[PDB]
Structure formats: structure tokens, C-alpha cells
């Protein structure tokens, strides 16, 4: 595809400015819906069955999400009736808001499509434009937090991250496993939003870098854990280092940079006089964790999978943020703990 | 009354169809197409809809630029029709 | 000429209706910002009150004066 | 009789019943006919022509003559009777139960719901504006302007060349 | 050291056996093969 | 909003804004105290020293406080049914 | 590769007087390698048959790797006489379609790149008869055919045009003495059964390579040698209704984009899926990495390396 | 905390351009060693012989993580300053949330063992 | 108060026909149709009895945005019916 799918591409990203830069409540529905024409096209790319299947259990979802959305929107008029995104002033209005982002986002009740979506994606440019589209909903959230109600977003956030922490260990599916740690991520995100919005901002910084040099890296085309083993002896061994930076900074680990958001949401909620939740977000987290410490095996390890080909020309990718951001996914908890302040 | 203009012509419209009937006794996906273009230009009509109805108060410097801006991205989605249409 | 004379005159041998596609639309485009007659039509319209005209409490001021015809405030008179 | 926009609020319930139903996609499209076109009439009666008929021109004139095409592309020839099919009317009969059952505590004006708002009375109250303007008024008499909303015209724009370039590549 | 056997155990199907899913086949390598068999395939007139 | 419109105007999002030509709007009067009142940050917290002026503004697009008014003296009128009735007009 | 909105484009001053003519089916006999010589005319490049130096030989630096480090214990002499207990079989044939990918590969970014008629000597579509004539006496497992079959279902669906000219070359049963009385000491000694069945596979397999709209010739042994008849039927013989004829903005761009690397090709090529024939050991797999680690081929880089070239350092 | 009289467009405000910015400073030089770490690794990934004795396109990955660093300390110097001047500003108005409790020498329980 | 019991009423119901199903995907996009139905009439009924005037024009847009899911959704219904004979709910391969 020649220059088409950098505009369709360009969309996006102007999509999204349209959510960012924004004060009317129809000028933020036309965001989001212009990420729904836009997305589905990059959905389907290679002809393939598994493409139409994907992307219909896509749009059926998000189309039903932002319609639920735009219900929020008219309540808006109903009582009150002014179109700024400042506050919802109803207890039921915010019910139908918090509920149609968590449709678009990958938390707790609506995380069924996020597996089977992420599977159905022909290749890695294609995975990246799902982690990137949750800055959408999340820059919403960031508008709204207050007059929202802590009894539906809480249990959304802890839930999730219980889903998250089973939901990849009887999966064997790289792109499963990344789809089940967005779900996990999520949960870590709207947990800070009452306490203090700040750092949701950052979370967001930390996660969608992260995610970003795992497919950069899954550039050599791996879909399984048997597929991504043979990487150790039949191709190059410093790359199975590289990404074991990313696979161990994804869960909570101190000495990389993933830690960095695990610093400051329990650090936030323990200001706050609550200790109960905190516990239950870490110990959580190790599920989350668990998922990695096998997928390491893969890489750390023989595991004989040797195969009789053996490639002598050597590999070329497109490889654009490949090499600038797993040094900052890697180390910057030493670097820059004083970013909080920077970002938000 | 609008109701009772209406209701008078679907009666007697019924009413042939009932003499028409009680009274005697004895595939292809290129299509699709032009169904899609149809109704993404109906919303470039019904969004220049109101050309003969708000031009009559609103500046004109302001509206003229946005109002042929709408015709030409009409064209423009034209232009890409035109490599490779179909067939048909 | 090397595509000026060409491409025309071929233009107008195969498929001449595309000729009227960009002429037709270029003159939309091009004639409104040339043309000195444009500042009549905004004059007009600005002139033409749907509202009610609303009277303002004078002290010491200039260009306004009472409801009857009087040398005073706007009021276009661009042929006749 | 006395009643405008409450009457026609009814049959406009009782066109959805037969999308919580799902009587085939063939009677379920006639739902969009006589909902959408009884849709104008709601609208019409608190005044702006303009917008009423949008409803005649876009999804009576265009989209449901698109989902017409669909129709006959996939899931074809003869629709199945509800009356036959299971569970169907089982949720056509329960939906109306819903609405119908609700209508008998909506006379003598006010009634108890899920929300705290009541139904009221719903005759002099049911306009709910005395004089307000006078020429080109009614709030929709200037309806629709590409002044002061400029930017509103591009983001438009945008999406319907976006909707022309994706559909032939998904096809 | 591990060997043939440890890599069949962590095979890609649902990592551990489970009673409700057996039947759930594991994916193609690469590029997923549709049922293109029993279509419309030209349509005849008479 | 999330970044800022600076140096550039989008806005048109409030009721009671710039006229189209000069229409009204009809709860107008109520959002000319609304905004007066809360165009500083002390009552967007906390949101209790504009409640007087907010309650009369839920009552101008809902009028359910007239709503429950009407309905008491049109069932008054219907218990006036047999009884000591009369009609002026 | 990327940027290809400018000047150089797919289809621009190619495909035409230019055309894929695959040289198949000898049967057992070196039969193919006389009539792609000949075929020199009209065709501009001509590539040799794969064999086991031919991975090693492309992309590498002129000389092949030895037979340690290059195909783990893989050679032509052991499939000269095949024999039980852990042998070659299978993973040779393997190797071999490996090598068969690279050299189409190499052909159709050649053929698309500067518009050049490019003759094969057999292609992709010809090694199954290769596998399955081995397959139907006791040589190969039942297991390891499936294995086969599911990286000919992946690799194959990436290409959309297979072949324009597929030549069809029939001997007599009598190959087995033009086998003998060619010099070769390897070749000779092979089951005259395992030749009678390649030559009888083959019929049932020229049928759909045919019947794929290509424009499928067959000649006889009288008919061979000759560089004016061949040529003149590859002229007046034109390819209608074809697979080959496609897009060239949609189809050809992502055709050239996935055969611009020979990593990204080969991809698929390595299955996950454990087979005890096809080398699954990975302690002396270690070693082997590191002697090609130690070789002074390629070891540094795609390009430049140290004793070897580099003008500058940056 | 949260932002209340500072403005978006130009991500120092400029007007509040009075604390003197990081000049040589530790923090720098680790973002630097970033810089040269992502200068390392470019070389592993994409295969180039020697992390430290290749190609000198290094250069510009020190250099653009020192620049953009810079602009991110100078912003980490205005915020810290901000949050710390509408906090001892909050104190200085009210007066009255703050209290003041000196002199004391309270009586307290003696463990044993 | 009184026409809206009804409309919200119709949309909740048309909220149960989305997320039930009886194998025909045709009706769940049928529905969608009558989701912004129900969508216009609501933010129709809020505008036009408080006269607001400027925002009129914004379920004009809302109309135009509702055709553009009610489209491009349904041509990837099309897609379904090209890989499979008839478009099912039940005709899945994704786990």
C-alpha cells in the first residue's frame, strides 16, 4: 500500500489530537469514532479469515461502546445542559460514561474481544495501533475525574487485574499474552484516577513504550512460545537479552524501569488512608509476573529447538523505535524519578 | 391538518388492494459498491443542505471557503474512485 | 509549449465533459477574490435587520438621532 | 385526541419491541419504516421542520435502502414467521408487557419509575414554550451554519473521505 | 538440561489440559487457510 | 481538556454564547447568574456556595418543581367533581 | 522498498517480453540441465539447480561453507544410497526445499527489479514429486510427509503468481542407462523402482500445474537439443488469463516487499512443531552457531567485516 | 497538586523563568550514559561488529537524549518550585489550618527487655 | 417527564436487542440503526424545547456519524458472507 495507509494512519493520530485538544462533548464523540473508520482497514490488511472474524467482533463491541457514550452525553443535556468536559452532575449519567470507556479500554466486564482481537491481527504494526488507541479513553478520564462514582470504577480496576493475573497462564499465544497484560495493565490505570488524576498521565508513558518494544522486537515473526523459542542458537543470541530487559520490566521489578508506575499508584493511595487495596493490587501482580517468568524459559534456557535451516543473511526489519526505547524501558527509575512532576 | 392529507391517500390506496385481491372468483458483490457511495454522498448533500437557507444572514468570506471545501472532498473521493472503479 | 498545447487539445479529443470539471469548478474558485463586486453583497446583508432594533440611553454622543429620516447612523443607500 | 407527541411516543416503543424480537431481518427492517417514520412526527411537533425530515431523507431515503441490499447478500429469500419461531415471541410478548402495563399508572397524570423523574400531566405542559421569537425563529428556522463552526465542517470532511478509501480496501 | 520432552509439555495448545477444552485445535504457523470449498462459484441461467 | 487552545479559538460549547443572529436562549437569565457565580475555582470543588443559584437552573430545563405544583391543583380540580365547582371561562 | 512513490515503481519499463519459464521434471537424470543452456536467447539469466553448497554460495562470499557447519551432517551422497537408523532422508529434502525457496526468491526480486526473462532449473512446484516417489517405498516416516505439507501450505500462499512457462519434460524408462553413461559415481547405483515412480507421480502432478492457468509445454527426447524449436514456441505461445496477471499497485508491491529479505521469507520456512528426524539437539547445535561464529565469512555483520574490507569505520 | 494558573502551548511558562537551570549537573550525565547505552544496543539488534568500535551515528543518540533531558530537567525545576511556592503561599494566607505546638516534655511508657 | 419515560424507555429496549441474539448478525446491525434513531430523537426533544439555537446543528452531524458506522461495519458483514456461505453467530473459528 503506497501513500493510503499513511493517511489512513495520519487519521489516527489526528483522531486522537481531536479527544486531546477538546472542550465540546460531540467534538470528543467524533474522536472516537474516527478511530472506528480508521482502525478496521489495518484490522483486515492481509485477506485473511481470521481478519474478517476479528474485526467484526471489534466493531460490534466499540460501536455499541461509543453509543452508550453519546447516551451520557444526551443525560448532559437532560439535567444541566451545558456541553463543557468538565464534570457529568448526575449519579446516573456517570454510571453510562465510566461503563462505555471500560468497553473501549481493556477493564474487567468488557475484556472478552481483547484476546480474539489481538489474535486476528495479520502483523506487528497492526498490534501496536490497540495499545496506543487506549491513550484515547484514558485522556477522557483524565477530564472527568471527579463526579464519578468509586463503588463502579474501583471494582472495575481490581477485578480486571484478577482476570489479568489467570487469564494468560493457560495461554501459549505471544499476541494472547499481550493482550491479557493490557487487561492487567488497566487496572494499575483507573486505580490512581480518584486519588490524585496525576501519574495516570505517566502510567500511560511507562506502558505504552514497554509494549511498544516487545512487537519492535517480535519484528522476527513469532506468534507461540515454540515459535519465539527457536531464536537462542538458529538466530542471534544477544536479541533473547534485549528483550529479557522487557520481559521482566513488564512485571514488578525494582531494578528496571516497570517498576516505576508501582512506585508511585500505592504511594498515592497509602497518602489516602487505604492500605487494604494496595496489598491486593502487588500480590495480584505477581500473576501478572508469572506470565513472564515462563515466557523467560523460553529465551534463558536450550529448550531444543534447534531446526535443521539455519539462516545466513541476516535480518532486516523496519526497526524505528527498536533501539531508542528499551534503553528507557530498561533504566530510568535511577534516571528520572522526579518525571511525575515533568509529565503531570 | 398534515394527518388527515396522509391517512385519506393510504386508505383508498389499501382500499384498491382490496379489490384487487377479494373481487375475482374463479450473489455478486460488485453491487455492494454502489450502495457504499450512495449513502457517504448523502451525507455530503445533507451536510450542504443548508447552502440555500443559511447563506441569507452569515458572512460570506467565511462561509465560501468552507462551503466549496465541502464540494471538492466530494470530488477529491471521486478521484480515488476513478483508479480501478469496476466493471460495471 | 510542451504540455500546455499538448495536453489540452487531447483532452479534448478523449473524455472533453472533464475539461468542464476543472474549468467550471476553477473559475468558482479563482473569479470571487478578483472581482471588485463582492463588497456590495456583505453590505447588504449585514444591513438587513431580522431582529428587533434595540435602543441604546444617550449621553453626549455622536452619529444617532431619532426614528424619524434624519442625517444619522448607518442606514445603506447603495444604489438606491 | 387531546394528545400529540404522547400518543406516537407508543408506537414508537412498539416498533423497538420488535427488535428486542427478532422476527427475521426482513420484519425487523419494517421496524425502521414505521419507527423512523412516526420518529419525524415527534420531532415535528415541537417544531423544526428541518430536522424532522432529515429522518425521510437519510434514514428512510438511504440507510435502511442500503440495509435492503445487505439483506438480500446475505440471509436471502424467504424471513421465517415469529409466530413459529421459539423464544421470539416470548420476547415480543414480555417486551410490550414492559411498556403497555406501564401506560395504565401514566393515567391519572402522575406515575412511580426506576428514575426519580414523573410522568406528569403532559397536555399544557407538553409545548412548553409561550411565544419566544418571531421571524426566521423556532430555533430552527437557522438551523444549520458553517459560520462560527468552522471547524465542525473539516472533521466531517475528513471521515466521509476516510469512509470512501477504507470500505474498497476492506473489499 | 532441557531436552524434546520439556518442550512438548509447554507446547503451543492451552498450556494445561483442561476438561472443557479438547477439541480447541492449535492455529497455523502463519496466515490462517479459509474453507474456500462449497461456494456460489458462477451462477447459471436458463 | 488534556492540551489547551492556545492562541486559537474552537470553542462554542456553552449555552448562552454568541446569538447565530440574535436568538435567545431559554434558560438565558438563570445561566448569566450560573456563570457569574462559578468562574473561579472555590465553588468547582467544593460546589455548595453556588447551590442556591443551581437549583433554580435544574428547575428552568426540567420544571419538575412545577411539574408536582400543577398536578396538585389539577387533582383538586378533579376532587371539586360533584362538590362546590365553578368555571369562569 | 519502502519509498516507492517516486521514480521506481512495479511494472514500470518490465513485464513485457520478460517472463518466469520454469525447466522441470529430469525425472532422476541430470535431463533439465542441457535444455536451460540452451534456453540462453531469449531468457537473460539462467540459475543452476539447488543443491546442499548452493545456501552458502548465495548471500555468503563466493566459496561454500563445509559440510559440518553449512547443513548439519547433510550430504548427496548419503540420499545416493539411503539407508535406516538415523540417517539423512527427510531432513535433506528439507534442506533441499529450503535452498529451492531462497533461489525463487532471489529469481522473482530479480524479475521484478530490471524486467529480465529468468529460467529455472525445478522449482517449488516440482519438489513434492521429488518427496512422494521417495515416500512410497520404505524410506521417509508417515509423520514427517505432514510436516512437509504444512510448510507447503504457508510458504507457497505468500507467492500469489507461481509460474507464466512450465517445461514438461517425459523420457523413456531406459534413463537409468543415459544415468549410467553420464560421469558421475554418486548418481549411479540408484533404485530403478524409486525412478519409475518419480517419473509416474509426476503425471498426476502435471495435471493441476496445468490446469492453474499456465502455459504448460511437453516435450520429448527427440524434441530436446534443440534451441530453435524451444525457442520459438516460448515466443508465439502467450500467457492468457493467468495468475500471473495481476495489480501491480496492491499485489506486486507486497510480493517484492516480502522477497526483498531472505530472513523474512525463510520465516515460515522454520516450524515449531518437534520432529526427531529434523534435528531437534540444541548442545551441539551450540557449537556448530559458534563455528560459524569462528568462520571468516559473514560472523560480524550483513555487509562489512574485519580482514575482509571495511574502508572506514563509520 | 493539580495545575491552576498555568496554561498549555510551550512546555516552560517562561514567566516563571527565574530559577537558575542544571548546568553539568549527575542527573545529566546518567541520561548521557542512556544516550551511549542506546548507542550500544543499536549495534546488537540491527548485527554491526564492536558496541564500542563501530559506526559514528552515536553521536546523535548522545545528543538527542541530553537535549530533550535538559528541556525535561528545566521543567522538573519549574514544577518542584510551583508546587512548593502555592504550598508555603496556602500557609501564609490561611494561617489558622496550620498549627504551631513547641515546649514539651511529655511523660511516655518504658518497655522492659 | 412525559415523552421521555417513552424514548429512553425504547432505547434501554433496543439496549437488551443488541446483546441478545438469535444467530443472525443482519438484526444486531439493524438494531444499531435503531440506536441512533433513538440517540436523534433524545437529543432532538432537549434542544428543540430549550431553544438553544446553536446546537441544532450538531444532530445533523450525529446523523452523519451514525451512517458512518452503519456502513462500514456493515461492509465487513459483506466480507463474512464471502469467506462463509451465510453470516452466523455461531460460525466462529477466533479462541
Not at chain 7, 561453507?65 to 528439507?94: M, T
Request: overall charge neutral; aromatic content about 12%; glycine content about 6%.
Amino acid at each position: 500500500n503506497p501513500i493510503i495507509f499513511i493517511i489512513i494512519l495520519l487519521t489516527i493520530m489526528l483522531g486522537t489530537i481531536i479527544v486531546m485538544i477538546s472542550s465540546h462533548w460531540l467534538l470528543v464523540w467524533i474522536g472516537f469514532e474516527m478511530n472506528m473508520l480508521a482502525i478496521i482497514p489495518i484490522m483486515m490488511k492481509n485477506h485473511n479469515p481470521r481478519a474478517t472474524e476479528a474485526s467484526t467482533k471489534y466493531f460490534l463491541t466499540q460501536s455499541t461502546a461509543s453509543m452508550l457514550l453519546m447516551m451520557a452525553v444526551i443525560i448532559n443535556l437532560m439535567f444541566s445542559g451545558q456541553w463543557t468536559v468538565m464534570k457529568l452532575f448526575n449519579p446516573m449519567a456517570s454510571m453510562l460514561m465510566t461503563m462505555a470507556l471500560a468497553m473501549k479500554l481493556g477493564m474487567a466486564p468488557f475484556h472478552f474481544w481483547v484476546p480474539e482481537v489481538t489474535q486476528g491481527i495479520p502483523l506487528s504494526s497492526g498490534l501496536i495501533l490497540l495499545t496506543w488507541q487506549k491513550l484515547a479513553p484514558m485522556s477522557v478520564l483524565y477530564q472527568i475525574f471527579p463526579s464519578i462514582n468509586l463503588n463502579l470504577i474501583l471494582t472495575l480496576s481490581v477485578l480486571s487485574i484478577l482476570i489479568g493475573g489467570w487469564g494468560g497462564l493457560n495461554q501459549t499465544q505471544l499476541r494472547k499474552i499481550m493482550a491479557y497484560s493490557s487487561i492487567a495493565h488497566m487496572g494499575w490505570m483507573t486505580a490512581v484516577l480518584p486519588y490524585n488524576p496525576t501519574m495516570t498521565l505517566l502510567n500511560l508513558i511507562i506502558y505504552i513504550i514497554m509494549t511498544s518494544t516487545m512487537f519492535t522486537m517480535f519484528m522476527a515473526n513469532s506468534t507461540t512460545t515454540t515459535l519465539s523459542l527457536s531464536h537462542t542458537w538458529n538466530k542471534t543470541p544477544i536479541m533473547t537479552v534485549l528483550i529479557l530487559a522487557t520481559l521482566l520490566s513488564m512485571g514488578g521489578l525494582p531494578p528496571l524501569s516497570g517498576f516505576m508506575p508501582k512506585w508511585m499508584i500505592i504511594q498515592e493511595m497509602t497518602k489516602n488512608n487505604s492500605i487494604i487495596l494496595p496489598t491486593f493490587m502487588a500480590i495480584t501482580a505477581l500473576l501478572n509476573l508469572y506470565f513472564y517468568m515462563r515466557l523467560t524459559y523460553s529465551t534463558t534456557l536450550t529448550m531444543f529447538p534447534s531446526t535443521n535451516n539455519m539462516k545466513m543473511k541476516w535480518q532486516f526489519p523496519l526497526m524505528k523505535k527498536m533501539t531508542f526505547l528499551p534503553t528507557m524501558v530498561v533504566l530510568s527509575t535511577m534516571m528520572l524519578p522526579l518525571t511525575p512532576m515533568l509529565s503531570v | 391538518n398534515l394527518m388527515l392529507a396522509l391517512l385519506t391517500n393510504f386508505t383508498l390506496a389499501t382500499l384498491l388492494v382490496i379489490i384487487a385481491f377479494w373481487l375475482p372468483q374463479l450473489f455478486s458483490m460488485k453491487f455492494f459498491l454502489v450502495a457504499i457511495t450512495f449513502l457517504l454522498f448523502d451525507l455530503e448533500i445533507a451536510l450542504l443542505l443548508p447552502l440555500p437557507w443559511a447563506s441569507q444572514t452569515a458572512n460570506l468570506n467565511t462561509m465560501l471557503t468552507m462551503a466549496l471545501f465541502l464540494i471538492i472532498l466530494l470530488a477529491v473521493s471521486l478521484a480515488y474512485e476513478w483508479t480501478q472503479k469496476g466493471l460495471e | 509549449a510542451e504540455r500546455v498545447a499538448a495536453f489540452l487539445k487531447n483532452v479534448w479529443a478523449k473524455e472533453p465533459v472533464l475539461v468542464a470539471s476543472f474549468a467550471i469548478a476553477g473559475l468558482a474558485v479563482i473569479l470571487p477574490t478578483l472581482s471588485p463586486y463582492t463588497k456590495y453583497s456583505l453590505m447588504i446583508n449585514x444591513x438587513x435587520x431580522x431582529x428587533x432594533x434595540x435602543x441604546x440611553x444617550x449621553x453626549x454622543x455622536x452619529x444617532x438621532x431619532x426614528x424619524x429620516x434624519x442625517x444619522x447612523x448607518x442606514x445603506x443607500x447603495x444604489x438606491x | 385526541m387531546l394528545y400529540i407527541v404522547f400518543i406516537l411516543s407508543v408506537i414508537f416503543v412498539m416498533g423497538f419491541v420488535g427488535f428486542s424480537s427478532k422476527p427475521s431481518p426482513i420484519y425487523g427492517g419494517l421496524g425502521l419504516i414505521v419507527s423512523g417514520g412516526v420518529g419525524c412526527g415527534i420531532v415535528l411537533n415541537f417544531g423544526g421542520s428541518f430536522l424532522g425530515l432529515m429522518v425521510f431523507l437519510i434514514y428512510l431515503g438511504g440507510m435502511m435502502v442500503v440495509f435492503g441490499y445487505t439483506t438480500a447478500m446475505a440471509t436471502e429469500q424467504y424471513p421465517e414467521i415469529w409466530l413459529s419461531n421459539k423464544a421470539v415471541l416470548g420476547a415480543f410478548v414480555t417486551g410490550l408487557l414492559m411498556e403497555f402495563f406501564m401506560v395504565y399508572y401514566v393515567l391519572k397524570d402522575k406515575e412511580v419509575e426506576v428514575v426519580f423523574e414523573f410522568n406528569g400531566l403532559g397536555d399544557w405542559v407538553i409545548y412548553d414554550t409561550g411565544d419566544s421569537g418571531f421571524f426566521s425563529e423556532e430555533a430552527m428556522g437557522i438551523a444549520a451554519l458553517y459560520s462560527y463552526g468552522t471547524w465542525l465542517v473539516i472533521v466531517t470532511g475528513w471521515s466521509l473521505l476516510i469512509g470512501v478509501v477504507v470500505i474498497m480496501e476492506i473489499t | 538440561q532441557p531436552d524434546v520432552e520439556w518442550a512438548e509439555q509447554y507446547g503451543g495448545a492451552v498450556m494445561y489440559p483442561t476438561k472443557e477444552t479438547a477439541h480447541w485445535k492449535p492455529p497455523p504457523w502463519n496466515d490462517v487457510d479459509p474453507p474456500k470449498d462449497t461456494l456460489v462459484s458462477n451462477l447459471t441461467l436458463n | 481538556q488534556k492540551r489547551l487552545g492556545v492562541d486559537l479559538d474552537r470553542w462554542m460549547t456553552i449555552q448562552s454564547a454568541e446569538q447565530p443572529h440574535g436568538i435567545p436562549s431559554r434558560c438565558h437569565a438563570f445561566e448569566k447568574e450560573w456563570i457569574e457565580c462559578a468562574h473561579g475555582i472555590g465553588s468547582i470543588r467544593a460546589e455548595k456556595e453556588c447551590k442556591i443559584e443551581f437549583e433554580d437552573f435544574r428547575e428552568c430545563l426540567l420544571r419538575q418543581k412545577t411539574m408536582k405544583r400543577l398536578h396538585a391543583i389539577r387533582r383538586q380540580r378533579e376532587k371539586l367533581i360533584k362538590e362546590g365547582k365553578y368555571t369562569p371561562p | 522498498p519502502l519509498a516507492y512513490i517516486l521514480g521506481e515503481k512495479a511494472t514500470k519499463k518490465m513485464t513485457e517480453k520478460s517472463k518466469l519459464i520454469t525447466v522441470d521434471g529430469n525425472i532422476c537424470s541430470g535431463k533439465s540441465k542441457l535444455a536451460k543452456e540452451i534456453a540462453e536467447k531469449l531468457g537473460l539469466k539462467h540459475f543452476p539447480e539447488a543443491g546442499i553448497h548452493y545456501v552458502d554460495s548465495t548471500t555468503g562470499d563466493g566459496k561454500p561453507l563445509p559440510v559440518q557447519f553449512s547443513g548439519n551432517c547433510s550430504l548427496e551422497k548419503f540420499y545416493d544410497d539411503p539407508k535406516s537408523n538415523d540417517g539423512n532422508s527427510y531432513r535433506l529434502q528439507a534442506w533441499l526445499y529450503a535452498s529451492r525457496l531462497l533461489q525463487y526468491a532471489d529469481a522473482l526480486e530479480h524479475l521484478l527489479s530490471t524486467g529480465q526473462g529468468v529460467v529455472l532449473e525445478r522449482s517449488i512446484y516440482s519438489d513434492f514429486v521429488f518427496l512422494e516417489a521417495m515416500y512410497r517405498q520404505g524410506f521417509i516416516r508417515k509423520q514427517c510427509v505432514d510436516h512437509y505439507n504444512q510448510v507447503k501450505k504457508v510458504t507457497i500462499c505468500e507467492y500469489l503468481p507461481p509460474h507464466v512457462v512450465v517445461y514438461v519434460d517425459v523420457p523413456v524408462p531406459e534413463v537409468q542407462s543415459r544415468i549410467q553413461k553420464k560421469g558421475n559415481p554418486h548418481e549411479m547405483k540408484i533404485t530403478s523402482a524409486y525412478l519409475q515412480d518419480i517419473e509416474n507421480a509426476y503425471k498426476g502432478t502435471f495435471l493441476p500445474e496445468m490446469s492453474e492457468k499456465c502455459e504448460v509445454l511437453q516435450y520429448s527426447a527427440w524434441e530436446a537439443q534443440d534451441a530453435e524449436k524451444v525457442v520459438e514456441d516460448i515466443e508465439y505461445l502467450k500467457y492468457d488469463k493467468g495468475p500471473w496477471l495481476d495489480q501491480n499497485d496492491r499485489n506486486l508491491h507486497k510480493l517484492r516487499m516480502l522477497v526483498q529479505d531472505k530472513l523474512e521469507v525463510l520465516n515460515y520456512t522454520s516450524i515449531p512443531v518437534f520432529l526427531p528426524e529434523v534435528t531437534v539437539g540444541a548442545h551441539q547445535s551450540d557449537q556448530v552457531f559458534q563455528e560459524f561464529t569462528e568462520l571468516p565469512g559473514r560472523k560480524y555483520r550483513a555487509g562489512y567485516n574485519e580482514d575482509v574490507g571495511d574502508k572506514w569505520i563509520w | 497538586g493539580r495545575q491552576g494558573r498555568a496554561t498549555f502551548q510551550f512546555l516552560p511558562d517562561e514567566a516563571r523563568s527565574l530559577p537558575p537551570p542544571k548546568l553539568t549537573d549527575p542527573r545529566l550525565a546518567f541520561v548521557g550514559f542512556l544516550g551511549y547505552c542506546s548507542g550500544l544496543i543499536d549495534n546488537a539488534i540491527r548485527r554491526r561488529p564492536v558496541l564500542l568500535a563501530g559506526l559514528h551515528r552515536q553521536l546523535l543518540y548522545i545528543t538527542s537524549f541530553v537535549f530533550v533531558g535538559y528541556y525535561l530537567l528545566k521543567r522538573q525545576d519549574y514544577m518542584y518550585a510551583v508546587r512548593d511556592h502555592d504550598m508555603f503561599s496556602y500557609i501564609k494566607s490561611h494561617x489558622x489550618x496550620x498549627x504551631x505546638x513547641x515546649x514539651x516534655x511529655x511523660x511516655x511508657x518504658x518497655x522492659x527487655x | 417527564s412525559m415523552v421521555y419515560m417513552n424514548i429512553m424507555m425504547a432505547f434501554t429496549v433496543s439496549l437488551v436487542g443488541l446483546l441478545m441474539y438469535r444467530s443472525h448478525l443482519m438484526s444486531s446491525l439493524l438494531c444499531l440503526e435503531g440506536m441512533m434513531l433513538s440517540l436523534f430523537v433524545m437529543a432532538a426533544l432537549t434542544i428543540l424545547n430549550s431553544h438553544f439555537t446553536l446546537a441544532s446543528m450538531m444532530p445533523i452531524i450525529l446523523l452523519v456519524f451514525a451512517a458512518c458506522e452503519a456502513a462500514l461495519g456493515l461492509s465487513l458483514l459483506v466480507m463474512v458472507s464471502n469467506t462463509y456461505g451465510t453470516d452466523y453467530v455461531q460460525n466462529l473459528n477466533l479462541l
